[PDB]
Amino acid sequence: DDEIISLSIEFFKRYLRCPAAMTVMHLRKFLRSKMDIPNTFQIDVMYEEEPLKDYYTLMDIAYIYTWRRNGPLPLKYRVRPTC
Amino acid sequence: DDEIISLSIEFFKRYLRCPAAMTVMHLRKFLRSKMDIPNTFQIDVMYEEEPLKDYYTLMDIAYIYTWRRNGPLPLKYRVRPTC
C-alpha cells in the first residue's frame, strides 16, 4: 500500500511515521544502526510478547493484530546473544 | 586476597577462573569488550535477579551471597538502553 503507518518502538519509546510496506527486517536494521548493535547480538521485534517474522509488513502486523488506528502501532524490541 | 575464584557468566554460559580481587566494574568491561557492546547500552551484572554494585569484588559477592564453593559462582548479565 501507498499508506503511512504511525507507530512506536521501545525496548522490552520513540515514534515513527513510516511506509506501511516496510518490514520487520527493515526495522531490525534500523534499530541495529540507530543503537549501533553488533552482530554479536540478535534483535527480536515484537508486538506484545511475541516476536514477528522478518517478512511481515507493518500492514500485515496491523491486520494480524487487528489494530484499529487508535494511537500508533506499539512495537517493542529486545536483544539476545546469538549462536 | 591472592585467591582464585571460579565462576560462570551467562545472559539473563561461559566459565571463568579469576582473581577474587576483581570487581563488577572489571567484569562489565570484560563483557563490553568480549561482546562488542556499544555505549548506547548499559550492562547489569547480577547474582540472581539483583544487580550488583560496581565496587563489589568477587569475594564480596561470595561473602554477601554466602556461596559455599559448591560449583562456580553463577553470575548473570543483561543489557538495557542507556539515557
Numbering used by the authors:
A (entry chain A), B (entry chain A): 127 to 138, 161 to 231
How does the study describe this entry?
The BMI1 protein, also known as PCGF4 (polycomb group RING finger protein 4), is a central component of the canonical PRC1 complex and has a dual role in PRC1 activity: regulation of H2A ubiquitination activity and mediation of protein–protein interactions. BMI1 is a 37 kDa protein composed of three distinct regions: a N-terminal RING domain2627, a central domain34 and a C-terminal proline-serine rich domain involved in the regulation of protein stability. The central domain of BMI1 was initially predicted as a putative helix-turn-helix (HTH) domain36 and more recently was defined as an ubiquitin-like (UBL) domain, also called RAWUL (RING finger- and WD40-associated ubiquitin-like) domain34. This domain is involved in protein–protein interactions and its best characterized binding partners are the polyhomeotic proteins (PHC1, PHC2, PHC3).
We obtained crystals of BMI1121–235 co-crystalized in the presence of the PHC233–56 fragment, which diffracted to 2.5 Å resolution. The structure confirmed that the central domain of BMI1 adopts an ubiquitin-like (UBL) fold. While we could refine the structure of the UBL domain we were not able to model the PHC2 fragment into the remaining electron density. The unmodelled electron density was found in a wide opening between the β2 strand and α1 helix at the interface between the two BMI1 UBL symmetry related molecules. The incomplete model of the complex is reflected by relatively high R-factor values. Superposition of the PHC2–BMI1 structure with the crystal structure of BMI1 UBL shows that the PHC2 fragment overlaps with the unmodelled electron density observed in the crystal. Since PHC2 binds at the interface of two symmetry related BMI1 UBL molecules, most likely in the crystal structure one molecule of PHC2 is bound to each monomer with 50% occupancy. This unusual binding stoichiometry observed in the crystal structure precludes modelling of the complex solely based on the X-ray data. Analysis of the crystal packing using PISA software suggests two possible homo-oligomerization interfaces. The second interface is centered around Ile212 and involves a cluster of tyrosine side chains (Tyr202, Tyr203, Tyr211 and Tyr213) that form a hydrogen bond network with backbone carbonyls.
